[PDB]
């Protein structure tokens, strides 16, 4: 491929497998969680990355994912102890002010809405919870949803609107929108093209498209069709419908556990079980009803074990971060 992926930094802070990494909205700090039941906040001073704070005793079991609030103030952690901790720096140091309980089993994912006042979690109990944030340190459950028939892997909020997306072990993706007259949450649509567990999902810049990676070694591009659309696609219900407009196959050897769509460049990165990170770019002449995505660069030996998560940097265009079961965090720089 014409593009190249360059390794900038390698970090080995945790002991054991590292599950999730997340960029601060300022792009100069990131956090990481793993099997060691600890969260590490990493700040960039000069040209060197270092751990500035270490958070322990927040979770008794493995921490699967951490996600920053749109404000640089609060951090959320989903763990296997059926809890979701909220961290805030009220004392000049990060402390756990609130804990969100309710899930019967392990919590798999968290997500913040664009506004920052809505928080969504999903667990192995096939449920998706949505919380409201009244004031600081206080959270109120808005809805408990059980549409998925199997383990729910990930929850991601819409960039422009307050729409929730969930990927599940039941091979499906589900959209969630709030109903206008009653102000109660409900499921908008169901996306059924993957033949196995859907691990990761990410919205496009505008939010009218969506990537999804799955256990079937494929990634899919979903397009939102509103009622009365120009295309020949018809919506029987009033709600918008999503359609699989592109399927990338044969590119991955094993399950793809995470996918990230950059809002600055439009590049798509995949974290696969074959230890490989792959970069995809939409073609210049790709049609909006049959888009074509081509792999511009890849690092098949990006890690020594499975790559668990990949995340683009919101401030720095082309900077990617990733973690793996080899216990390493790697910051990358892609040049097309």
């Amino acid at each position: 491929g014409r593009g190249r992926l360059i390794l900038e930094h390698t970090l080995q802070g945790h002991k054991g497998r590292i599950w999730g990494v997340a960029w601060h909205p300022k792009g100069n700090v990131f956090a990481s969680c793993g099997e060691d039941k600890a969260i590490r906040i990493w700040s960039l001073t000069g040209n060197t990355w270092s751990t500035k704070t270490i958070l322990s005793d927040g979770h008794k079991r493995t921490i699967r994912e951490i996600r920053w609030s749109p404000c640089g103030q609060y951090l959320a952690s989903a763990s296997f102890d059926a809890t979701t901790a909220i961290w805030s720096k009220s004392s000049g140091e990060f402390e756990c002010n609130a804990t969100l309980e309710g899930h019967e089993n392990e919590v798999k994912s968290v997500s913040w809405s664009r506004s920052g006042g809505l928080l969504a979690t999903c667990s192995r109990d096939k449920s998706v919870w949505i919380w409201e944030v009244a004031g600081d340190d206080e959270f109120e459950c808005a809805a408990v949803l059980n549409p998925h028939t199997q383990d729910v892997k990930r929850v991601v909020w819409h960039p422009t609107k307050d729409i929730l997306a969930s990927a599940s072990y039941d091979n499906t993706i589900k959209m969630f929108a709030e109903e206008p007259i009653d102000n109660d949450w409900d499921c908008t649509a169901t996306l059924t093209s993957h033949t196995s567990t859907v691990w990761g999902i990410d919205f496009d810049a505008d939010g009218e498209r969506l990537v999804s990676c799955s256990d079937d070694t494929t990634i899919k591009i979903w397009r939102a069709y509103h009622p009365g659309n120009t295309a020949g696609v018809a919506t029987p219900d009033q709600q918008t419908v999503w359609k699989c407009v592109c399927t990338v196959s044969g590119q991955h050897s094993r399950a793809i556990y995470d996918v990230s769509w950059c809002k600055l460049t439009g590049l798509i990165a995949t974290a696969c079980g074959d230890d490989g990170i792959r970069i995809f770019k939409e073609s210049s002449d790709s049609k909006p009803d049959e888009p074509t995505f081509e792999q511009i660069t890849a690092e098949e030996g990006a890690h020594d074990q499975d790559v668990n998560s990949v995340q683009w940097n919101p401030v720095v265009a082309g900077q990617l971060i990733s973690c793996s079961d080899d216990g390493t965090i790697k910051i990358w720089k892609v040049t097309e």
Partner: peptide, 12 residues
């Protein structure tokens, strides 16, 4: 058995 996340959670 092929879901590495569920296998890990089971080992805990």
């Amino acid at each position: 058995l092929a879901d590495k996340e569920r296998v890990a959670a089971a080992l805990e």
